[PDB]
Amino acid sequence: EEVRQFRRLFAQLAGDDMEVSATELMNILNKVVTRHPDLKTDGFGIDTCRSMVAVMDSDTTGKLGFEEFKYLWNNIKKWQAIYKQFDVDRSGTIGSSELPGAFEAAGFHLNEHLYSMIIRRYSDEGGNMDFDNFISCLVRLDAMFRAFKSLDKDGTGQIQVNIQEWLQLTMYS
Amino acid sequence: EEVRQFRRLFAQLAGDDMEVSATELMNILNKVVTRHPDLKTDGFGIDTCRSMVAVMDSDTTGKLGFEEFKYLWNNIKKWQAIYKQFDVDRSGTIGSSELPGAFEAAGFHLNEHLYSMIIRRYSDEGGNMDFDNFISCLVRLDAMFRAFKSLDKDGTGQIQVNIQEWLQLTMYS
Ligand SMILES: [Ca+2]
Ligand SMILES: [Ca+2]
Ligand SMILES: [Ca+2]
Ligand SMILES: [Ca+2]
Ligand SMILES: [Ca+2]
Ligand SMILES: [Ca+2]
Ligand SMILES: [Ca+2]
Ligand SMILES: [Ca+2]
């Protein structure tokens, strides 16, 4: 069964301390993207992986346990499919005019101002976003959405935080 | 005069569009750290530089204007001196027990929980933080402190933000 083998894959990757570190994540992600040249990327750098691990480290162990990893992994599989689905011109990258569609297909409805911010931070000089940038952006985006929602359970449209919560949320990412 | 030559240095680095991009920043920072082997680092990666630029891009031009760059540059000079001052064992890295002193010397008084979060995100398996990590952490930390303060001018100890402000603040960094 697929479930059983994924479980084994995690155990194999996590190794000795049984959790996946940012370095362990980087290695499996780069080794996997290489098998997909149709996904333009300069690779998953260590800093990007430490950001993805932190944002996914809900139990604050510093690394990814099975569930955290499973969630991340499935999200990546889903976003990888979307990435290719919306790269209509086969540039191997998500361009400025393909981004809104890709994000909305991933379940994220942002506005013009937010999209421009995203492009400025995760896209290149030509408004192009490669695969590792696309994936890390969405991992972070999904996480920031979840964080806001969990802090606004009554749906008031606003959250209130002190400096310690603020720094924990913004720095550990 | 030093002021005049720094102004020229910025103009030279910013080039054609007269602002310093993340790539332009990365290049000058790496070319400068190399002249200091006493500063252990795997170098300033592009993703780290895009994070530093975004967090410093107060006018949201996507790049660093003279003032933004000047502020960043002076901060780095100041933190570089502190980095060496507190690396008492000359490991070329700021270790777990040197961190609190370094940060407090930089004007940041955090608590145990915040420091542990920092170590988990910016230090290595051995609790060691290299130069590029140290600098990018403080750039971000200083920025998150300023952002909170500007949103809490009455000093109530809390800020209240909607989802759009939240995402702008957390994603553009
Ligand atoms: Ca491990
Ligand atoms: Ca964890
Ligand atoms: Ca495309
Ligand atoms: Ca990239
Ligand atoms: Ca420029
Ligand atoms: Ca700017
Ligand atoms: Ca040291
Ligand atoms: Ca580093």
Coordinates of C-alpha atoms and ligand atoms in Angstrom, one line a residue:
Chain A
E1 CA 0.0 0.0 0.0
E2 CA 1.2 3.6 -0.7
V3 CA 0.5 4.7 2.9
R4 CA 2.9 2.0 4.2
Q5 CA 5.7 2.9 1.8
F6 CA 5.5 6.6 2.4
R7 CA 5.8 5.9 6.1
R8 CA 9.0 3.9 5.4
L9 CA 10.3 6.7 3.1
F10 CA 9.9 9.1 6.0
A11 CA 11.7 6.9 8.5
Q12 CA 14.5 6.3 6.0
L13 CA 14.9 10.0 5.3
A14 CA 14.6 11.2 8.9
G15 CA 17.3 8.8 10.0
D16 CA 18.8 8.7 13.5
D17 CA 16.8 11.3 15.3
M18 CA 13.7 10.3 13.5
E19 CA 12.7 13.7 12.2
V20 CA 13.5 15.5 8.9
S21 CA 15.9 18.4 9.3
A22 CA 16.2 21.3 6.9
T23 CA 19.3 19.7 5.4
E24 CA 17.6 16.3 5.0
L25 CA 14.6 18.1 3.4
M26 CA 16.9 20.0 1.0
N27 CA 18.6 16.8 -0.1
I28 CA 15.5 14.9 -0.9
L29 CA 13.9 17.9 -2.6
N30 CA 16.9 18.6 -4.9
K31 CA 17.3 14.9 -5.7
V32 CA 13.7 14.8 -6.7
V33 CA 13.5 18.1 -8.8
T34 CA 16.4 16.9 -10.9
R35 CA 14.2 14.1 -12.2
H36 CA 11.9 16.9 -13.5
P37 CA 13.8 19.3 -15.9
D38 CA 10.4 20.6 -16.9
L39 CA 10.6 22.4 -13.5
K40 CA 13.1 25.2 -13.9
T41 CA 15.0 25.8 -10.6
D42 CA 18.3 26.9 -9.3
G43 CA 17.7 24.3 -6.6
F44 CA 16.4 24.3 -3.0
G45 CA 18.9 26.2 -1.0
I46 CA 19.5 25.5 2.7
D47 CA 18.1 28.8 3.9
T48 CA 14.8 28.2 2.0
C49 CA 14.5 24.8 3.5
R50 CA 15.1 26.1 7.1
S51 CA 12.3 28.5 6.4
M52 CA 10.0 25.8 5.2
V53 CA 10.9 23.5 8.2
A54 CA 10.3 26.3 10.8
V55 CA 7.0 27.3 9.3
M56 CA 5.9 23.6 9.4
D57 CA 7.3 22.9 12.8
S58 CA 4.0 23.2 14.8
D59 CA 5.3 21.2 17.8
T60 CA 8.5 23.3 17.8
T61 CA 10.9 20.3 17.8
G62 CA 13.1 22.2 15.3
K63 CA 12.5 19.5 12.7
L64 CA 9.7 17.7 10.8
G65 CA 7.9 14.8 12.4
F66 CA 5.9 12.3 10.3
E67 CA 2.7 14.3 10.2
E68 CA 4.3 17.7 9.5
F69 CA 6.3 16.1 6.7
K70 CA 3.3 14.2 5.3
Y71 CA 1.4 17.5 5.2
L72 CA 4.3 19.3 3.5
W73 CA 5.0 16.5 1.1
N74 CA 1.4 16.2 -0.1
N75 CA 1.1 19.9 -0.4
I76 CA 4.2 19.9 -2.6
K77 CA 2.8 17.1 -4.8
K78 CA -0.4 19.1 -5.3
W79 CA 1.4 22.4 -6.0
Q80 CA 3.8 20.7 -8.4
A81 CA 0.8 19.5 -10.5
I82 CA -0.6 23.0 -10.4
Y83 CA 2.7 24.6 -11.3
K84 CA 2.9 22.6 -14.5
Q85 CA -0.9 23.0 -15.2
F86 CA -0.6 26.8 -15.2
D87 CA 2.8 27.1 -17.0
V88 CA 0.9 27.3 -20.2
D89 CA 3.9 28.6 -22.3
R90 CA 6.1 25.8 -20.9
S91 CA 8.7 28.3 -19.8
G92 CA 9.3 26.0 -16.9
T93 CA 8.5 28.9 -14.7
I94 CA 5.3 30.6 -13.5
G95 CA 5.1 34.0 -15.1
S96 CA 3.5 37.2 -13.9
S97 CA 0.3 36.5 -15.8
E98 CA 0.1 32.9 -14.8
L99 CA 0.5 33.5 -11.0
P100 CA -3.0 34.5 -10.0
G101 CA -4.5 31.5 -11.7
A102 CA -1.9 29.1 -10.1
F103 CA -2.5 30.5 -6.6
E104 CA -6.3 30.6 -6.9
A105 CA -6.1 27.0 -8.1
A106 CA -4.1 26.2 -4.9
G107 CA -7.0 27.8 -3.0
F108 CA -5.5 31.2 -2.3
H109 CA -7.5 34.3 -3.4
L110 CA -5.3 37.3 -3.0
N111 CA -5.7 40.8 -4.5
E112 CA -3.6 42.9 -6.8
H113 CA -1.6 44.5 -4.1
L114 CA -0.8 41.2 -2.4
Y115 CA 0.1 39.6 -5.8
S116 CA 2.5 42.5 -6.6
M117 CA 4.1 42.0 -3.2
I118 CA 4.6 38.3 -4.0
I119 CA 6.1 39.0 -7.4
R120 CA 8.5 41.5 -5.9
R121 CA 9.7 39.0 -3.3
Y122 CA 9.6 35.6 -5.1
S123 CA 9.8 36.3 -8.8
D124 CA 12.8 37.4 -10.9
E125 CA 13.5 40.7 -12.7
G126 CA 11.2 39.6 -15.5
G127 CA 8.4 38.7 -13.2
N128 CA 9.2 35.0 -13.4
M129 CA 9.0 32.5 -10.5
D130 CA 11.0 29.3 -10.6
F131 CA 9.9 26.0 -8.9
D132 CA 11.7 26.3 -5.5
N133 CA 10.5 29.9 -5.1
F134 CA 7.0 28.9 -6.0
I135 CA 6.9 26.0 -3.5
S136 CA 8.5 27.9 -0.7
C137 CA 6.2 30.9 -1.2
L138 CA 3.1 28.7 -1.0
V139 CA 4.4 26.7 2.0
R140 CA 4.8 30.0 3.8
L141 CA 1.6 31.5 2.5
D142 CA -0.5 28.5 3.5
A143 CA 1.2 28.7 6.9
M144 CA 0.5 32.4 7.4
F145 CA -3.1 31.8 6.5
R146 CA -3.4 29.0 9.0
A147 CA -1.7 31.0 11.7
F148 CA -4.1 33.9 11.2
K149 CA -7.2 31.7 11.2
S150 CA -6.1 29.9 14.4
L151 CA -5.7 33.2 16.1
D152 CA -9.2 34.4 14.9
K153 CA -11.5 31.5 15.6
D154 CA -14.5 33.7 15.9
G155 CA -13.9 35.2 12.5
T156 CA -13.7 38.8 13.5
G157 CA -11.3 39.6 10.6
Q158 CA -8.5 40.7 13.0
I159 CA -5.9 39.2 15.4
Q160 CA -4.3 40.9 18.3
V161 CA -0.8 39.9 19.4
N162 CA 1.9 41.0 21.9
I163 CA 5.5 41.5 20.9
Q164 CA 6.6 38.0 22.0
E165 CA 3.9 36.3 19.9
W166 CA 4.7 38.7 17.0
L167 CA 8.4 37.8 17.1
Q168 CA 7.8 34.1 17.5
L169 CA 5.5 34.1 14.5
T170 CA 7.6 36.4 12.2
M171 CA 11.1 35.2 13.1
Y172 CA 10.4 31.5 13.2
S173 CA 9.7 31.3 9.5
Chain B
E1 CA 34.8 62.9 3.1
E2 CA 33.5 59.4 3.9
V3 CA 29.9 60.5 3.4
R4 CA 30.6 61.6 -0.2
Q5 CA 32.4 58.3 -1.1
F6 CA 29.7 56.1 0.4
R7 CA 27.2 58.0 -1.7
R8 CA 29.3 57.3 -4.8
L9 CA 29.7 53.6 -3.8
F10 CA 25.9 53.3 -3.6
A11 CA 25.4 54.9 -7.0
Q12 CA 28.1 52.6 -8.5
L13 CA 26.5 49.4 -7.0
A14 CA 22.9 50.4 -7.7
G15 CA 23.7 50.8 -11.4
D16 CA 21.2 51.6 -14.1
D17 CA 17.9 51.6 -12.2
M18 CA 19.6 53.4 -9.3
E19 CA 18.5 51.1 -6.5
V20 CA 20.3 48.0 -5.1
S21 CA 18.5 44.7 -6.0
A22 CA 18.8 41.5 -4.0
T23 CA 21.3 40.2 -6.5
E24 CA 23.4 43.4 -6.4
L25 CA 23.3 43.2 -2.6
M26 CA 24.4 39.5 -2.6
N27 CA 27.3 40.3 -4.9
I28 CA 28.8 43.1 -2.8
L29 CA 28.2 41.3 0.5
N30 CA 30.0 38.1 -0.7
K31 CA 32.8 40.1 -2.3
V32 CA 33.2 41.8 1.1
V33 CA 33.0 38.8 3.4
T34 CA 35.7 37.0 1.5
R35 CA 38.1 39.7 2.7
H36 CA 37.3 38.5 6.2
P37 CA 38.1 34.8 6.6
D38 CA 37.7 35.4 10.4
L39 CA 34.0 35.4 9.5
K40 CA 32.9 31.8 8.9
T41 CA 30.2 31.7 6.3
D42 CA 28.9 29.6 3.4
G43 CA 28.1 32.9 1.8
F44 CA 25.1 35.2 1.3
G45 CA 22.6 33.2 -0.8
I46 CA 20.1 34.9 -3.1
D47 CA 17.1 33.9 -1.1
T48 CA 18.6 35.4 2.1
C49 CA 19.3 38.6 0.2
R50 CA 15.8 38.8 -1.2
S51 CA 14.6 38.5 2.4
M52 CA 16.9 41.3 3.6
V53 CA 15.9 43.6 0.7
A54 CA 12.1 43.0 1.2
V55 CA 12.3 43.6 4.9
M56 CA 14.3 46.9 4.3
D57 CA 12.1 48.0 1.4
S58 CA 9.9 50.5 3.3
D59 CA 8.8 52.4 0.2
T60 CA 8.0 49.1 -1.5
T61 CA 10.0 49.8 -4.7
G62 CA 11.2 46.2 -4.6
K63 CA 14.8 47.4 -4.2
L64 CA 17.0 49.4 -1.9
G65 CA 17.2 53.2 -2.4
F66 CA 20.1 55.1 -0.9
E67 CA 18.6 55.6 2.6
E68 CA 17.4 52.0 3.0
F69 CA 20.8 50.8 1.8
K70 CA 22.7 53.2 4.1
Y71 CA 20.7 52.0 7.1
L72 CA 21.3 48.4 6.2
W73 CA 25.0 48.9 5.5
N74 CA 25.7 50.8 8.8
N75 CA 23.7 48.1 10.7
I76 CA 25.9 45.4 9.1
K77 CA 29.1 47.3 10.0
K78 CA 27.9 47.6 13.6
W79 CA 26.8 44.0 13.8
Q80 CA 30.0 42.7 12.2
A81 CA 32.0 44.4 15.0
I82 CA 29.8 42.8 17.6
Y83 CA 30.0 39.4 15.9
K84 CA 33.7 39.4 16.3
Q85 CA 33.6 41.0 19.8
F86 CA 31.5 38.1 21.1
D87 CA 33.1 35.2 19.3
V88 CA 35.4 34.8 22.2
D89 CA 36.6 31.3 21.3
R90 CA 37.4 32.6 17.8
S91 CA 35.4 29.8 16.2
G92 CA 34.5 32.3 13.5
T93 CA 30.9 31.6 14.5
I94 CA 28.5 32.8 17.2
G95 CA 27.8 29.9 19.5
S96 CA 24.8 29.1 21.6
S97 CA 26.4 30.6 24.7
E98 CA 27.7 33.7 22.9
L99 CA 24.4 34.6 21.2
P100 CA 22.5 36.3 24.1
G101 CA 25.5 38.6 24.7
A102 CA 25.8 39.5 21.0
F103 CA 22.1 40.2 20.6
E104 CA 21.9 42.3 23.8
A105 CA 25.0 44.2 22.6
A106 CA 23.1 44.9 19.4
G107 CA 20.2 46.3 21.5
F108 CA 17.9 43.3 21.5
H109 CA 16.8 41.9 24.8
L110 CA 14.9 38.6 24.2
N111 CA 14.0 35.8 26.6
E112 CA 15.0 32.1 26.8
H113 CA 12.1 31.0 24.7
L114 CA 12.8 33.5 21.9
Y115 CA 16.5 32.7 21.9
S116 CA 15.8 29.0 21.6
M117 CA 13.5 29.8 18.6
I118 CA 16.3 31.8 17.1
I119 CA 18.9 29.1 17.5
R120 CA 16.5 26.5 16.0
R121 CA 16.0 28.6 12.9
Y122 CA 19.4 30.3 12.4
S123 CA 22.0 28.1 14.0
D124 CA 23.4 24.8 12.9
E125 CA 23.0 21.3 14.5
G126 CA 25.7 22.3 17.0
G127 CA 24.0 25.5 18.0
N128 CA 26.4 27.5 15.9
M129 CA 25.5 30.5 13.8
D130 CA 27.7 31.7 10.9
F131 CA 28.0 35.3 9.7
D132 CA 25.4 35.4 6.9
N133 CA 22.9 33.8 9.2
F134 CA 23.7 36.2 12.1
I135 CA 23.4 39.2 9.8
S136 CA 20.2 38.2 8.1
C137 CA 18.6 37.2 11.5
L138 CA 19.4 40.6 13.0
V139 CA 18.2 42.5 9.9
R140 CA 14.9 40.7 10.1
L141 CA 14.7 41.0 13.9
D142 CA 15.4 44.7 13.8
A143 CA 12.7 45.1 11.1
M144 CA 10.1 43.1 13.0
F145 CA 10.8 45.1 16.1
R146 CA 10.3 48.4 14.2
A147 CA 7.2 47.1 12.5
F148 CA 5.6 46.3 15.8
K149 CA 6.5 49.6 17.4
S150 CA 5.2 51.6 14.4
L151 CA 1.9 49.7 14.8
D152 CA 1.7 50.4 18.6
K153 CA 2.6 54.1 18.9
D154 CA 0.7 54.4 22.2
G155 CA 2.7 51.6 23.7
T156 CA -0.2 49.3 24.7
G157 CA 1.9 46.2 24.2
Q158 CA -0.3 44.8 21.4
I159 CA -1.0 45.4 17.8
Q160 CA -4.2 44.5 15.9
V161 CA -4.1 43.6 12.2
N162 CA -6.4 42.3 9.5
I163 CA -5.5 39.4 7.2
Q164 CA -4.2 41.7 4.4
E165 CA -1.8 43.6 6.7
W166 CA -0.8 40.3 8.3
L167 CA 0.1 38.7 4.9
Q168 CA 1.9 41.9 3.7
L169 CA 4.0 41.9 6.8
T170 CA 4.8 38.2 7.0
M171 CA 5.1 37.3 3.3
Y172 CA 7.1 40.4 2.3
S173 CA 10.2 39.4 4.3
Ligands
CA1 CA 17.1 13.5 10.9
CA2 CA 8.2 19.3 14.5
CA3 CA 5.2 30.3 -17.8
CA4 CA 14.8 29.7 -7.0
CA5 CA 20.2 48.2 -9.7
CA6 CA 12.9 50.7 -1.6
CA7 CA 32.3 31.3 19.0
CA8 CA 25.0 30.6 6.5

